[PDB]
């Protein structure tokens, strides 16, 4: 079982992602909110991906399903098939 793993997304990783976006200063409360946003986004993508796997009578999530699912969320991905 896995319990309280979202904290594995470290604070320097969020710092690096913000630096990529051009952010100069970062408040201390940003990290928990960012973790929550990432959890919401991942849940939304994973729900559709697991539904696509369940319909095909498969037991493994493939890359194509994840592409199809993000494209269904308006987040089309190039480079992993389609």
């Amino acid at each position: 079982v896995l319990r309280d793993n979202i904290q594995g997304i470290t604070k320097p990783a969020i710092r690096r992602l913000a630096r990529r976006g051009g952010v100069k200063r970062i408040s201390g409360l940003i990290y928990e909110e960012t973790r929550g946003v990432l959890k919401v986004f991942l849940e939304n993508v994973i729900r559709d991906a697991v539904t696509y796997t369940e319909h095909a009578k498969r037991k493994t999530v493939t890359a194509m399903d994840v592409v199809y699912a993000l494209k269904r969320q308006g987040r089309t991905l190039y480079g992993f098939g389609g």
Partner: protein, 94 residues
């Protein structure tokens, strides 16, 4: 020539759920547009999802999965239950 519509059926279900309430013509147009749009969404999702598995048939499974993909939350679950209820009722008769 004529043009089909869902007006009579919408009026029937309204009389089922609210016997003392009528409906204006503009609201009838909005309800017809709503039913048509939902129809196109579910049919297109089912057609795509069927095309993914290299299948030629839209069955109850494809419609059920499309309903789970589009409808957000508990609505999907309720719709799925009633749809299954309708299918077995059809299967129980002939």
């Amino acid at each position: 020539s004529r043009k089909e519509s869902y007006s009579i059926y919408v009026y029937k279900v309204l009389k089922q759920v609210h016997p003392d309430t009528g409906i204006s013509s503009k609201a009838m147009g909005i309800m017809n547009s709503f039913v048509n749009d939902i129809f196109e969404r579910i049919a297109g999702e089912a057609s795509r999802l069927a095309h993914y598995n290299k299948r030629s048939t839209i069955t109850s499974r494809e419609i059920q999965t499309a309903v789970r993909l589009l409808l957000p939350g508990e609505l999907a679950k309720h719709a799925v239950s009633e749809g299954t209820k309708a299918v077995t009722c059809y299967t129980s008769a002939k």
